[PDB]
């Protein structure tokens, strides 16, 4: 039970950081497209 809860936490944070990364740095690639394409 403890280890499934801890894996639960590691998955939730891997998703959270993945969301932050994808959002921010897709905004970055949007700037890339707008200002060099």
């Amino acid at each position, epitope marked *: 039970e403890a280890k499934i809860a801890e894996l*639960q936490a590691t*998955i*939730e944070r891997l*998703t*959270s950081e*993945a*969301a*932050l990364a*994808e*959002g*921010a740095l*897709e*905004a970055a*690639r*949007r700037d890339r*497209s707008r200002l060099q394409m």
Partner: nanobody
Amino acid sequence: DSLRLSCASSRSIDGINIMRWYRQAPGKQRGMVAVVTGWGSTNYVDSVKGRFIISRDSAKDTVYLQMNNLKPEDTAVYSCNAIYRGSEYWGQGTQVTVS
């Protein structure tokens, strides 16, 4: 103003883990947008942070995305994503068009 999009799950009903949704504007590249874990936690992306609402309803096991207070630029293809046993899967994509 606000709408909804579904993700019909066919088999391994509640193989539930990351059910994220992707946003692909034409020419623009796809992107994971809103996530429901296997167990209730929900992180979206800043790009729509606090704007949409995600919801997993295992009654028919079709994870919902509450497209809230629509404004134009979201107009794109939206799809659904699933992970079962570490295997990626892909929807067929739907065309959202607003304003």
